[PDB]
Write a protein that binds this ligand. Sequence first.
Ligand SMILES: CCCCCCCCCCCCCCCCCC(=O)OC[C@H](COP(=O)(O)OC[C@H](O)CO)OC(=O)CCCCCCCCCCCCCCC
Ligand SMILES: CCCCCCCCCCCCCCCCCC(=O)OC[C@H](COP(=O)(O)OC[C@H](O)CO)OC(=O)CCCCCCCCCCCCCCC
Ligand SMILES: CC(C)CCC[C@@H](C)[C@H]1CC[C@H]2[C@@H]3CC=C4C[C@@H](OC(=O)CCC(=O)O)CC[C@]4(C)[C@H]3CC[C@]12C
Ligand SMILES: CC(C)CCC[C@@H](C)[C@H]1CC[C@H]2[C@@H]3CC=C4C[C@@H](OC(=O)CCC(=O)O)CC[C@]4(C)[C@H]3CC[C@]12C
Ligand SMILES: CC(C)=C[C@H]1[C@H](C(=O)Nc2ccc(-c3ncccn3)c(Br)n2)C1(C)C
Ligand SMILES: CC(C)=C[C@H]1[C@H](C(=O)Nc2ccc(-c3ncccn3)c(Br)n2)C1(C)C
Lengths: 470, 470
Amino acid sequence: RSFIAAVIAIGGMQLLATMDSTVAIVALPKIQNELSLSDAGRSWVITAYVLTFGGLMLLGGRLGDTIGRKRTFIVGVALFTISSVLCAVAWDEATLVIARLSQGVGSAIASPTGLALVATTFRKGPARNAATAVFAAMTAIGSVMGLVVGGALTEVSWRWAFLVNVPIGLVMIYLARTALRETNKERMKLDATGAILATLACTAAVFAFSIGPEKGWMSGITIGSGLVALAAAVAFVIVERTAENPVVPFHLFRDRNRLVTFSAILLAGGVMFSLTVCIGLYVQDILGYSALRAGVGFIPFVIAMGIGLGVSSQLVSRFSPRVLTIGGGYLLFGAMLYGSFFMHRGVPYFPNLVMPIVVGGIGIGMAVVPLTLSAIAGVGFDQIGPVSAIALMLQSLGGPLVLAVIQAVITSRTLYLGGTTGPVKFMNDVQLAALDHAYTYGLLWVAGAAIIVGGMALFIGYTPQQVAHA
Amino acid sequence: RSFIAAVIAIGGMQLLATMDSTVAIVALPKIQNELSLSDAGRSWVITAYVLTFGGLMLLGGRLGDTIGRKRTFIVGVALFTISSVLCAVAWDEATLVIARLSQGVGSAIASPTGLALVATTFRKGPARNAATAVFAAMTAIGSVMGLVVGGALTEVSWRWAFLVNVPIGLVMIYLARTALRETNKERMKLDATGAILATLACTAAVFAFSIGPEKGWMSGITIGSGLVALAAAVAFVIVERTAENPVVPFHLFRDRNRLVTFSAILLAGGVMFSLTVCIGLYVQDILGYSALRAGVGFIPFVIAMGIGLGVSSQLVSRFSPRVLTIGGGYLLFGAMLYGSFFMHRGVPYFPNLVMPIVVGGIGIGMAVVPLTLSAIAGVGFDQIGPVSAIALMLQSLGGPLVLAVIQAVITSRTLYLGGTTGPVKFMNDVQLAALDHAYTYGLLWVAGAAIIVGGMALFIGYTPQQVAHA
Ligand SMILES: CCCCCCCCCCCCCCCCCC(=O)OC[C@H](COP(=O)(O)OC[C@H](O)CO)OC(=O)CCCCCCCCCCCCCCC
Ligand SMILES: CCCCCCCCCCCCCCCCCC(=O)OC[C@H](COP(=O)(O)OC[C@H](O)CO)OC(=O)CCCCCCCCCCCCCCC
Ligand SMILES: CC(C)CCC[C@@H](C)[C@H]1CC[C@H]2[C@@H]3CC=C4C[C@@H](OC(=O)CCC(=O)O)CC[C@]4(C)[C@H]3CC[C@]12C
Ligand SMILES: CC(C)CCC[C@@H](C)[C@H]1CC[C@H]2[C@@H]3CC=C4C[C@@H](OC(=O)CCC(=O)O)CC[C@]4(C)[C@H]3CC[C@]12C
Ligand SMILES: CC(C)=C[C@H]1[C@H](C(=O)Nc2ccc(-c3ncccn3)c(Br)n2)C1(C)C
Ligand SMILES: CC(C)=C[C@H]1[C@H](C(=O)Nc2ccc(-c3ncccn3)c(Br)n2)C1(C)C
């Protein structure tokens, strides 16, 4: 009863953050009709969360070492819960932007500490292997359960959708309080100069990337904010050399296989993120299931992924992470190919749409566990903080980058086959068929990116003794 | 009975050609002990057969039209059969070389006509699909049965090995005589100047490549012969513009998907060729099975190959060649990955060495049939001759090229891990472990080549209406 309570508490922020993002996206169209925030404000509610979530993410990595990882986890989750309540009672656009800024700060504080708690709370061995599976298992639960909740309690009001996090947030705080123990180690002085430059460099980069399309890539404020990011980034590296308790220990990333493992997650995260966002759009637009039905139809993915994580936790003590990652990705590669050849509009559900999802889910579940274990292997307690933060940012950073390329490919072929750029509802059913074949074509590009991840995963070379089995 | 006799007769030369090459390589060591032809003579017996087999191949494409395909086939097999008897009673080195040269001339005339008879004898539809399966099926039966025969009666004398072709050749001549019909059409005059230059251009290039390693790549005769090959090639193309009944119709090869198809066969043949040669060497040297046991152990591959060919023949009329080629290659890709990870020395036979061979066999069987059908699609009768000849040359030419790269990689890593270059009988059993890991490392390189074939097979774009089902 103490072990199940501990694992659930550590992964709580993963469930909340993933679920919040899915619920926010689903409710965007209805927020217009009530607040009337125009198209410009449509994207600000989304970028507002990401502006502070990514800008302050590396600050939260080192924050646990100077304050305490348990007291940082509770504070991060508590602030996130309070922000949801405020977000649900926003009377104008202004209140909603500040409400979303607060959520990003709360997620930035807690998300890196959640992964760092896995390494320190559980000793290396079977305990850590099971904890990692539960950590990754409920990241997918939040995504699917968001679709069900967001698509169900949205025909009454969008405000109630944001209130669903309060019952969940309260439980995780209670479990974390009554299941986690505070380590008795002396606190470490925070890196002042290195931290401010890192926060200023990351936030400026995200602002310029987000505002670029709105104002144009060469507007003047886009590259104008890009200049600050480069100046901030440059200064950050120089003062890191003579930094005590470094925010980013660059010396820790040498020509060894640490770069390979951290490069795989960056591109692997991009493949995963672009795969869910495209599949979600395809189901809603081309097949027209709607939000509630799509969420219920993806329940087998969670069950299928649960099997993959459960099996991989046992095998990770006997096979190296190299073979498991390749073995898991081999099943996923077959799933994408089948969906790229026999996935036209009008097919039934159980024969055609369920099987590739189930097989794809098992393949992903098998490969997630070995990668996470090797990312936090052979670090220690005085550098697990920053290393955990770097692992998650690369996973999050790879999402938008790969997705941008895929969406560009989708649009280009839509016009080639005969198509129109705009809302799907105004389509003559011959332009729609072009959109259907554009999405199927894009699935080949995602598969191509998966091959690169597999190829670069052959260089990892970790043995099962190091990552686990101790 | 009539149909069965026709398909067997047409594919006869594939069985003989593949069996003869496998038997010759096995009996090379003893030909030294009796004839005493020295190390220099070791390669002339092999290169003699390939010098004329590749030199005269393009002349045999257009021979069928000027005299007749049935008569050309019988003449080609007959001269091959007579040469084997003369090869079996060679007095010394000299008599053996002319014995091997004659076999190459006979196989050059009959092999291109064998594939042409498939297109012109069976109308497009289920008949052709079945005929294509048998044509590719007996290529593997000859390969495996060569090892058994070459390892079974090699302990008494190498002269009995070459006489095994005589009983098989005599049956195939009888079947072709009483099962194939002579076509009643007017003959087309043979291209004198174009044919002569092509034989000179191709023969000189093969000679230069073969003798280069012996005398060095910059000896003077190596590049000296290469100049003659280049001079012949340019003269061949210039005259070929104003040629009647052209030997090589370049105009037939345009930017359409014929180049993509013919490019895949060139590289696909290399992957297939390098896979059997390397696997045979690994089995004999590392596992120490011996020739007879290796031949008997590869029987499941033939049965697995037969199942893949049979299934693909039925599916080719419902699914395009693009998906079948990818589907078959996907199974093979998994088989080679498994071998690259769990194929150390001393593993048992049934669980480890059989299953990857069986799975790989089905993958290859599925992919060859769609590729063969698409290679002879949309051609006609007045140009089937040269097109079939080009298909075989590209398949055979891709073998040595890809194999040379793979062998260099295996040799380089053997020294890296600690080993020696030389006979495998004088290794320390620590130097042999390095060789074992080198072979499995090379298998990944073959997988890299296989991926490129799949990537370039996505551009085929033939519908099932064109290649079959008509
Ligand atoms: C990486 C390790 C790092 C460790 C560093 C530390 C961190 C460790 C944890 C990592 C967690 C990653 C796993 C989570 C996966 C995310 C996806 C998910 O949990 O949820 C499922 C999602 C449903 O979508 P959602 O509802 O989430 O969408 C939201 C929209 O925003 C709403 O609109 O996707 C899928 O089902 C995946 C199926 C894939 C199978 C292959 C496809 C076959 C083809 C079928 C036809 C499709 C058309 C063709 C193709 C176009
Ligand atoms: C494309 C056509 C276009 C149309 C053009 C028209 C023409 C069409 C013809 C197409 C030809 C294809 C069929 C014939 C294939 C021939 C291969 C064969 O039927 O024969 C078995 C062979 C063994 O070779 P042999 O014994 O014959 O060689 C003897 C040496 O010569 C002695 O010196 O291959 C295999 O076993 C297959 C292996 C597949 C699975 C992958 C391996 C898994 C790992 C296992 C452990 C190995 C060690 C690790 C790896 C190192
Ligand atoms: C006529 C149709 C059927 C052909 C369409 C398929 C090919 C043109 C696709 C198949 C695989 C694709 C490749 C698959 C993967 C990649 C990885 C991708 O690599 C990345 O750098 C990821 C993006 C990034 O993070 O920058 C670049 C494109 C490329 C080479 C793709 C190029 C286009 C290819 C060859
Ligand atoms: C050191 C260990 C732990 C890693 C294994 C080495 C990998 C880094 C190798 C294995 C697969 C290799 C690739 C496999 C295949 C190719 C195709 C190869 O292209 C050809 O095969 C051309 C053949 C021809 O001449 O026609 C070029 C190298 C490349 C990219 C290889 C690059 C190096 C890779 C990734
Ligand atoms: C050269 C080579 C042998 C490539 C391997 C590719 C692969 O499948 N590579 C792979 C392996 C794992 C993951 C993954 N999937 C989800 C989450 C995290 N990682 C991914 Br995208 N791709 C294939 C099976 C073709
Ligand atoms: C980009 C992409 C989707 C690649 C496909 C590769 C493939 O598997 N490609 C392939 C397909 C067929 C054959 C074959 N095999 C034997 C005889 C004839 N053809 C071969 Br070598 N490779 C994989 C399954 C990774």
